[PDB]
Write a protein that holds these residues in place. Structure first.
Motif, PDB file in Angstrom:
ATOM      1  N   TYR L  36       0.840  -1.187   0.000  1.00  0.00           N
ATOM      2  CA  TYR L  36       0.000   0.000   0.000  1.00  0.00           C
ATOM      3  C   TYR L  36       0.878   1.241   0.000  1.00  0.00           C
ATOM      4  O   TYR L  36       1.914   1.273   0.667  1.00  0.00           O
ATOM      5  CB  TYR L  36      -0.925   0.022   1.218  1.00  0.00           C
ATOM      6  CG  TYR L  36      -1.598  -1.296   1.511  1.00  0.00           C
ATOM      7  CD1 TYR L  36      -0.996  -2.236   2.330  1.00  0.00           C
ATOM      8  CD2 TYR L  36      -2.837  -1.597   0.970  1.00  0.00           C
ATOM      9  CE1 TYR L  36      -1.606  -3.440   2.601  1.00  0.00           C
ATOM     10  CE2 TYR L  36      -3.456  -2.799   1.233  1.00  0.00           C
ATOM     11  CZ  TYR L  36      -2.837  -3.717   2.050  1.00  0.00           C
ATOM     12  OH  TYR L  36      -3.452  -4.918   2.317  1.00  0.00           O
ATOM     13  N   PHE L  37       0.469   2.258  -0.748  1.00  0.00           N
ATOM     14  CA  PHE L  37       1.234   3.490  -0.880  1.00  0.00           C
ATOM     15  C   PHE L  37       0.382   4.664  -0.424  1.00  0.00           C
ATOM     16  O   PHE L  37      -0.751   4.828  -0.888  1.00  0.00           O
ATOM     17  CB  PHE L  37       1.700   3.677  -2.322  1.00  0.00           C
ATOM     18  CG  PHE L  37       2.579   2.565  -2.817  1.00  0.00           C
ATOM     19  CD1 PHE L  37       3.937   2.571  -2.560  1.00  0.00           C
ATOM     20  CD2 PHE L  37       2.045   1.510  -3.532  1.00  0.00           C
ATOM     21  CE1 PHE L  37       4.745   1.550  -3.008  1.00  0.00           C
ATOM     22  CE2 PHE L  37       2.849   0.488  -3.982  1.00  0.00           C
ATOM     23  CZ  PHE L  37       4.200   0.507  -3.719  1.00  0.00           C
ATOM     24  N   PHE L  38       0.926   5.480   0.479  1.00  0.00           N
ATOM     25  CA  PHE L  38       0.177   6.557   1.107  1.00  0.00           C
ATOM     26  C   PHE L  38       0.974   7.852   1.103  1.00  0.00           C
ATOM     27  O   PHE L  38       2.205   7.853   1.199  1.00  0.00           O
ATOM     28  CB  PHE L  38      -0.198   6.224   2.551  1.00  0.00           C
ATOM     29  CG  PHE L  38      -0.962   4.951   2.698  1.00  0.00           C
ATOM     30  CD1 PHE L  38      -2.110   4.733   1.969  1.00  0.00           C
ATOM     31  CD2 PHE L  38      -0.530   3.971   3.569  1.00  0.00           C
ATOM     32  CE1 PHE L  38      -2.811   3.562   2.103  1.00  0.00           C
ATOM     33  CE2 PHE L  38      -1.228   2.799   3.706  1.00  0.00           C
ATOM     34  CZ  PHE L  38      -2.367   2.594   2.973  1.00  0.00           C
ATOM     35  N   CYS L  39       0.245   8.956   0.995  1.00  0.00           N
ATOM     36  CA  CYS L  39       0.791  10.289   1.170  1.00  0.00           C
ATOM     37  C   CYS L  39      -0.255  11.135   1.871  1.00  0.00           C
ATOM     38  O   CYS L  39      -1.449  11.015   1.586  1.00  0.00           O
ATOM     39  CB  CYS L  39       1.182  10.930  -0.164  1.00  0.00           C
ATOM     40  SG  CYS L  39       2.078  12.485   0.013  1.00  0.00           S
ATOM     41  N   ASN L  40       0.193  11.986   2.791  1.00  0.00           N
ATOM     42  CA  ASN L  40      -0.732  12.815   3.549  1.00  0.00           C
ATOM     43  C   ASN L  40      -1.432  13.856   2.689  1.00  0.00           C
ATOM     44  O   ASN L  40      -2.419  14.443   3.143  1.00  0.00           O
ATOM     45  CB  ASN L  40       0.007  13.508   4.693  1.00  0.00           C
ATOM     46  CG  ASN L  40      -0.919  13.949   5.804  1.00  0.00           C
ATOM     47  OD1 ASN L  40      -2.037  13.455   5.929  1.00  0.00           O
ATOM     48  ND2 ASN L  40      -0.456  14.883   6.624  1.00  0.00           N
ATOM     49  N   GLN L  52       7.776   8.783  -9.332  1.00  0.00           N
ATOM     50  CA  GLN L  52       8.495   7.732 -10.054  1.00  0.00           C
ATOM     51  C   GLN L  52       7.537   6.801 -10.790  1.00  0.00           C
ATOM     52  O   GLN L  52       7.807   5.610 -10.951  1.00  0.00           O
ATOM     53  CB  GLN L  52       9.400   6.933  -9.116  1.00  0.00           C
ATOM     54  CG  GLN L  52      10.573   7.717  -8.564  1.00  0.00           C
ATOM     55  CD  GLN L  52      11.422   6.893  -7.622  1.00  0.00           C
ATOM     56  OE1 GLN L  52      10.989   5.853  -7.131  1.00  0.00           O
ATOM     57  NE2 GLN L  52      12.638   7.354  -7.363  1.00  0.00           N
ATOM     58  N   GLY L  53       6.407   7.337 -11.240  1.00  0.00           N
ATOM     59  CA  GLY L  53       5.426   6.553 -11.955  1.00  0.00           C
ATOM     60  C   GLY L  53       4.472   5.761 -11.091  1.00  0.00           C
ATOM     61  O   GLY L  53       3.599   5.074 -11.635  1.00  0.00           O
ATOM     62  N   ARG L  54       4.599   5.830  -9.771  1.00  0.00           N
ATOM     63  CA  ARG L  54       3.718   5.118  -8.860  1.00  0.00           C
ATOM     64  C   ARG L  54       2.783   6.103  -8.176  1.00  0.00           C
ATOM     65  O   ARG L  54       3.204   7.184  -7.755  1.00  0.00           O
ATOM     66  CB  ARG L  54       4.516   4.344  -7.810  1.00  0.00           C
ATOM     67  CG  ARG L  54       3.680   3.374  -6.998  1.00  0.00           C
ATOM     68  CD  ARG L  54       4.358   2.021  -6.895  1.00  0.00           C
ATOM     69  NE  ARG L  54       5.721   2.130  -6.391  1.00  0.00           N
ATOM     70  CZ  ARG L  54       6.673   1.232  -6.606  1.00  0.00           C
ATOM     71  NH1 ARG L  54       6.443   0.139  -7.315  1.00  0.00           N
ATOM     72  NH2 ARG L  54       7.884   1.434  -6.097  1.00  0.00           N
ATOM     73  N   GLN L  55       1.513   5.726  -8.071  1.00  0.00           N
ATOM     74  CA  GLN L  55       0.498   6.577  -7.468  1.00  0.00           C
ATOM     75  C   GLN L  55       0.400   6.275  -5.979  1.00  0.00           C
ATOM     76  O   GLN L  55       0.091   5.143  -5.590  1.00  0.00           O
ATOM     77  CB  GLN L  55      -0.854   6.367  -8.145  1.00  0.00           C
ATOM     78  CG  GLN L  55      -1.139   7.331  -9.276  1.00  0.00           C
ATOM     79  CD  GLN L  55      -2.610   7.649  -9.402  1.00  0.00           C
ATOM     80  OE1 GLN L  55      -3.464   6.801  -9.147  1.00  0.00           O
ATOM     81  NE2 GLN L  55      -2.919   8.878  -9.796  1.00  0.00           N
ATOM     82  N   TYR L  56       0.660   7.282  -5.154  1.00  0.00           N
ATOM     83  CA  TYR L  56       0.502   7.191  -3.711  1.00  0.00           C
ATOM     84  C   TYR L  56      -0.835   7.820  -3.351  1.00  0.00           C
ATOM     85  O   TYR L  56      -1.055   9.013  -3.605  1.00  0.00           O
ATOM     86  CB  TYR L  56       1.653   7.888  -2.988  1.00  0.00           C
ATOM     87  CG  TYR L  56       3.003   7.268  -3.259  1.00  0.00           C
ATOM     88  CD1 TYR L  56       3.640   7.450  -4.475  1.00  0.00           C
ATOM     89  CD2 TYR L  56       3.639   6.493  -2.301  1.00  0.00           C
ATOM     90  CE1 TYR L  56       4.868   6.884  -4.729  1.00  0.00           C
ATOM     91  CE2 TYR L  56       4.868   5.921  -2.546  1.00  0.00           C
ATOM     92  CZ  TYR L  56       5.477   6.121  -3.762  1.00  0.00           C
ATOM     93  OH  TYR L  56       6.702   5.557  -4.019  1.00  0.00           O
ATOM     94  N   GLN L  57      -1.721   7.015  -2.774  1.00  0.00           N
ATOM     95  CA  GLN L  57      -3.086   7.440  -2.537  1.00  0.00           C
ATOM     96  C   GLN L  57      -3.145   8.447  -1.393  1.00  0.00           C
ATOM     97  O   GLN L  57      -2.307   8.425  -0.490  1.00  0.00           O
ATOM     98  CB  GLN L  57      -3.966   6.238  -2.211  1.00  0.00           C
ATOM     99  CG  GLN L  57      -3.858   5.101  -3.212  1.00  0.00           C
ATOM    100  CD  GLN L  57      -4.295   5.504  -4.606  1.00  0.00           C
ATOM    101  OE1 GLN L  57      -5.192   6.329  -4.776  1.00  0.00           O
ATOM    102  NE2 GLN L  57      -3.660   4.921  -5.616  1.00  0.00           N
ATOM    103  N   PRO L  58      -4.124   9.349  -1.412  1.00  0.00           N
ATOM    104  CA  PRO L  58      -4.287  10.277  -0.289  1.00  0.00           C
ATOM    105  C   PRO L  58      -4.852   9.556   0.924  1.00  0.00           C
ATOM    106  O   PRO L  58      -5.853   8.843   0.829  1.00  0.00           O
ATOM    107  CB  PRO L  58      -5.265  11.327  -0.829  1.00  0.00           C
ATOM    108  CG  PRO L  58      -5.367  11.068  -2.304  1.00  0.00           C
ATOM    109  CD  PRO L  58      -5.074   9.627  -2.496  1.00  0.00           C
ATOM    110  N   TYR L  59      -4.200   9.746   2.068  1.00  0.00           N
ATOM    111  CA  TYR L  59      -4.630   9.153   3.327  1.00  0.00           C
ATOM    112  C   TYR L  59      -3.878   9.817   4.473  1.00  0.00           C
ATOM    113  O   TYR L  59      -2.658   9.990   4.392  1.00  0.00           O
ATOM    114  CB  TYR L  59      -4.387   7.642   3.327  1.00  0.00           C
ATOM    115  CG  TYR L  59      -5.298   6.864   4.248  1.00  0.00           C
ATOM    116  CD1 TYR L  59      -6.651   6.744   3.979  1.00  0.00           C
ATOM    117  CD2 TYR L  59      -4.803   6.243   5.381  1.00  0.00           C
ATOM    118  CE1 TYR L  59      -7.482   6.033   4.816  1.00  0.00           C
ATOM    119  CE2 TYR L  59      -5.626   5.529   6.220  1.00  0.00           C
ATOM    120  CZ  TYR L  59      -6.965   5.428   5.934  1.00  0.00           C
ATOM    121  OH  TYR L  59      -7.791   4.718   6.772  1.00  0.00           O
ATOM    122  N   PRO L  60      -4.561  10.207   5.545  1.00  0.00           N
ATOM    123  CA  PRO L  60      -3.867  10.868   6.658  1.00  0.00           C
ATOM    124  C   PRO L  60      -2.877   9.951   7.357  1.00  0.00           C
ATOM    125  O   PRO L  60      -3.270   8.954   7.968  1.00  0.00           O
ATOM    126  CB  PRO L  60      -5.011  11.276   7.596  1.00  0.00           C
ATOM    127  CG  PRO L  60      -6.249  11.201   6.768  1.00  0.00           C
ATOM    128  CD  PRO L  60      -6.012  10.131   5.762  1.00  0.00           C
TER     129      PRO L  60
END
Ligand code: SF4
Ligand code: SF4
Ligand code: SF4
Lengths: 33, 232, 49, 50, 122, 98, 49, 33, 33, 232, 55, 232
Positions: L36-40, L52-60
């Motif tokens: 799983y990939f996350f960004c605040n 880098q071509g990967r989608q980091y989903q929005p999540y606190p």
């Protein structure tokens, strides 16, 4: 004083107090904590 | 009951008392320095405070943690002083951070101070009225561009000491070179590497058996030249 | 600021037993009193180490 | 029998038929600095328990 | 304006901190000259017992199962201990003592004690 | 002014120690504190330990008390044999607890 | 508030070994239950001490 | 509440709490601190 | 902030900090408190 | 699940419930004293609260630290009471600071209190509705001119106890004099100093062998008259 | 050397001075706390009347 | 000095710098899960952040306690994440509370992000500019209806480990079944209760001597079948 920011500051000061008190209880008489 | 004079106890019980000044002295003679005299205040004439004929220079300084207790850890006071203009810094880089120095603290009622400090004079001046305490410097806890802080300790402080201290060893001497137990007084013979020298500034014992033999001091050797084989 | 140390090594010459080696700094003993410690040199089997 | 030095020396029994005598030479280490000494003398040296 | 000095009920429940109400101290926050939170040492200093406030209460050596039930102290020794890296000792008056063996050498004695006359066998 | 054999003091002391063998535990502690060779005499040293307090302590420890076998005995006595290197605080606490 | 004590001293009469002497206060044992401790009399070689 | 005077009081209360807790942990179960 | 209610809260925060610290000092390096 | 009646469970789940009063009892009979009944409140008629026919006097008192936990230290509650007019002081100087007393707490819904306490009466009074808890007093932690604080403890509290307890000794008896193990019932013989007396109030065993012999009880001697020589 | 001991057993004869006696709870093979020990010369004869010193 | 590129060094020294974003990755592949990939934060177009071509989903999500120290305890970070809508809950009931998972943390200056994230594009986009750190999950400290908190630890963390580890035993095998030290590769013989079975899923050594004999592996037995009598 807002509660949120004050409670963490109090907690950190308390942990520093534990630092100091354990270290000073490892002295000669003390309690060796 | 501290050996303090009757005038001080007379002044203590008064309802309206004079100011109680504290005068500090830093003595680094035993470690290689001088004696510095400090007081947190000037006198009414804007001059360093004159007590018993000695001028205590004005400098911000104050202590805390002073108490007399027996149960528990030995009390460790703390002395905070100003490090503006880099005075303490200069002493820290010079006198091994003042470690081992002696801090003397005097409590004196302002009523008993010398008549010099007052414009109208002091008819009540009595240079015998003081309460003295001595402490040692254990560690310069803080030293910043603003201030310095020192940890004080009682001169006894049996913290790192052990008892008994003398240790049994083989192939090593536990005596102090040219000390009373060593008993040596001869001329320069060799250095700590057993190299023959005639120089008095390069004359130290190697603490080995050959070093002792170089000075014909084997009878005074601090080691025990048999115990290495009995411990096998 | 310690000035005297007792290191416990194991001698392979006398017998494989614990020998204590005392290391001192007489210059510092004239300055910071005399503070002594004990240390166990973990892999030491040679006096020099 | 002294202070700072002593000699002891209870005598040895004369042998009957030649033979060698094994000797046990030991040096102990007690106390530090000047000490008073034995309580009594040779009566205060317990070889094994006597 | 006062000295508060926290006792033991104030620290044990918010009961008497509201007794004196600390109103003047709290509204005044404090001052440099006067210190708060004195924390009287009544109960804490007496936790181990009154006799600990008058004498340091010497300790006893750790019990070792290797000795069957023999009790050892810290001020006696009847054994000839090893004398390497072991401190000499200290004896203070009287007592029957062991030792730290400095030397021990089993050899062959030589006939004769003193004087002149010696007889090997009789 | 102290004769260890009879454990009797003469009068005022005024200091000026004397090299005599005694069982007085107070002066055993004094030796422990202020001996340079093996004790705590290098650190600390004399004029840091109240000798008059130890003087009164020794006088108290020399008083005669019922023995329990019908006789009398000094209040507190030495005869320790310290063989294991303990911390100076430990030995001081044992002396000040005896 | 201890009421029973076991003091470890060294007997010079039987043999220089550790003897335990028990001291009790039966009046206090009827009041605060019974609290017992162990003590090592540092210089004691006499039962009375 | 001024910060200067409050932080020292909080630190001293922390030290007292450390004393009380260390002494509490030397009880039967506890942790012997 | 009233003194009465605040002092107990600070004391309890200090006790909790001492708990956390004594527990975290029994970790690998720590000091074993 | 505590042995508590169904009426209390009915009252607990109600949205609007009556006041929950706590009634305290101090029992010093086992330490030599009387029983004191206290409640923090009066009733609507300004009288001490009547519960189960007993009058609990008005007095400021409240407790804290009450919990049921097994992991960790045994819970030590605390009870704070008013020491105005020197009542607790009077007991503390009288009854060894109340040490060893028994503190009994009762939780009762005011709905179930006796009809006496209310002007209009209580048709719902049920004197069997209560939750009881017992504790002991361990130390009067504080006692000032204002208040007093007590440290309660569970009656078990295996703090200073050891197991096994009996100790092997020579030249001393570990039995309780005239106890079951001692088994002695004879007349007065001697005191603790082996002095012959006929007075029953000065008859205590010396706990030595001679004291046992004075009563011809050597068979029941608690010591072991051989172990002194085997320990050498 | 590498022997593991417990808190609920003992197979040796320990010293019995200031040691608490012990406690045993069912079965087990136990050591003891020696209360007395005396090596002496036994007296000839066991019981009854007839005794022969040697034969 | 960390192996970090010169562009990051140039950006660190600038007075006015771009925002430093932190991207988190949870990797449960080694424990039986996914990555799983996350960004605040989202990006300016309201989309998950593309790095880098990967989608980091929005999540606190936010971490703290990150530091590099050697003296004392091994540092234990902490990661706080949102548990609204019961996502982390679903993981905790599924992946054994995520224990043993790997948390990878990347620090990236926003100036170096991919041009997708910006409306006008990024000329300085450089997918090699990142600072990476790895940690493990030790305990899900908190998990409520609002949030979840995880304790992180360094992958080394020599806390419960001992050395040496292999233990001398009799009547038991310390080897891992079909492991390299065990060296067994035969067909199914029996289960852990020594019951004969031909099923491969029910084939496990009993770790006793009889279980080893069932597979003719007594040469490879991990125990020592003599030490039970020498320890008496
Ligand atoms: S080896 Fe000999 S000369 Fe050197 S310090 Fe020791 S006693 Fe003195
Ligand atoms: S010594 Fe004898 S009489 Fe005295 S208490 Fe013990 S058993 Fe009873
Ligand atoms: S007992 Fe034999 S077959 Fe079983 S795990 Fe051990 S070595 Fe392998």
């Amino acid at each position: 004083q807002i509660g949120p920011a004050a409670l963490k500051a109090v907690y950190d000061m308390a942990r520093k107090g534990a630092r100091d008190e354990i270290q000073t209880q490892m002295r000669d008489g003390g309690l060796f904590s | 009951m501290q050996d303090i004079r009757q005038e001080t106890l007379n002044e203590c019980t008064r309802a309206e008392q004079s100011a109680s000044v504290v005068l500090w002295e830093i003595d680094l003679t035993e470690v290689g320095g001088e004696r510095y005299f400090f007081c947190n205040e000037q006198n009414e004439k804007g001059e360093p405070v004159t007590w018993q004929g000695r001028q205590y220079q004005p400098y911000p300084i104050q202590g805390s943690g002073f108490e007399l207790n027996g149960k528990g850890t030995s009390t460790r006071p703390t002395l905070t002083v100003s490090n503006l203009y880099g005075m303490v810094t200069g002493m820290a880089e010079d006198m091994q951070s003042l470690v081992g120095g002696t801090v003397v603290r005097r409590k004196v009622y302002a009523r008993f101070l010398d008549a010099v400090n007052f414009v109208n004079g002091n008819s009540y001046a009595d240079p015998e009225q003081e309460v003295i305490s001595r402490w040692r410097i254990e560690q310069c806890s803080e030293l910043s561009a603003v201030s310095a802080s020192f940890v004080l300790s009682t001169p006894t402080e049996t913290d790192g000491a052990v008892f008994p201290g003398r240790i049994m060893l083989a192939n090593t001497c536990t005596w102090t070179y040219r000390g009373d137990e060593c008993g040596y007084s001869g001329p320069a013979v060799a250095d700590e590497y057993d190299q023959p020298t005639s120089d008095i500034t390069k004359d130290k014992c190697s603490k080995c058996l050959s070093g002792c033999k170089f000075r014909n001091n084997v009878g005074n050797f601090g080691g025990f030249l048999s115990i290495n084989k009995l411990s096998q | 600021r310690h000035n005297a140390v007792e290191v416990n090594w194991i001698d392979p010459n006398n017998g494989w037993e614990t020998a204590t080696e005392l290391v001192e700094d007489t210059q510092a003993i004239a300055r910071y009193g005399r503070n002594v410690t004990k240390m166990d040199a973990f892999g030491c089997t040679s006096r020099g180490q | 029998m002294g202070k700072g030095s002593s000699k002891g020396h209870t005598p040895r029994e004369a042998k009957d038929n030649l033979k060698s005598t094994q000797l046990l030479s030991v040096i102990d280490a007690i106390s530090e600095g000047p000490i008073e000494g034995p309580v009594d003398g040779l009566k205060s040296v317990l070889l094994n328990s006597t | 304006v006062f000295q508060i000095v926290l006792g033991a009920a104030a620290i044990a429940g918010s009961f008497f901190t509201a007794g004196a109400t600390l109103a003047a101290w709290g509204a005044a926050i404090g001052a440099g000259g006067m210190t708060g939170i004195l924390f009287s040492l009544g109960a804490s200093m007496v936790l181990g017992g009154v006799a600990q406030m008058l004498a340091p209460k010497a300790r006893t050596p750790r019990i070792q199962t290797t000795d069957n039930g023999k009790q050892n102290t810290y001020f006696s020794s009847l054994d000839n201990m090893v004398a390497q890296g072991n401190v000499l000792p200290v004896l203070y008056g009287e007592m029957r003592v062991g030792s730290r063996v400095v030397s021990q050498e089993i050899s062959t004695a030589d006939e004769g004690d003193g004087g002149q006359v010696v007889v090997i066998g009789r | 002014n102290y004769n260890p054999q009879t454990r009797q003091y003469s009068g005022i002391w005024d200091g000026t120690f004397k090299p005599a063998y005694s069982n007085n535990m107070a002066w055993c502690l004094w030796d422990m504190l202020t001996h340079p060779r093996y004790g705590m005499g290098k650190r600390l040293g004399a004029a840091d330990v109240d000798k008059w307090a130890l003087y009164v302590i020794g006088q108290y420890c020399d008083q005669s008390v019922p023995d329990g076998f019908g006789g009398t005995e000094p209040r507190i006595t030495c005869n320790a044999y310290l063989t294991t290197q303990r911390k100076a605080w430990d030995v001081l606490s044992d002396f000040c607890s005896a």
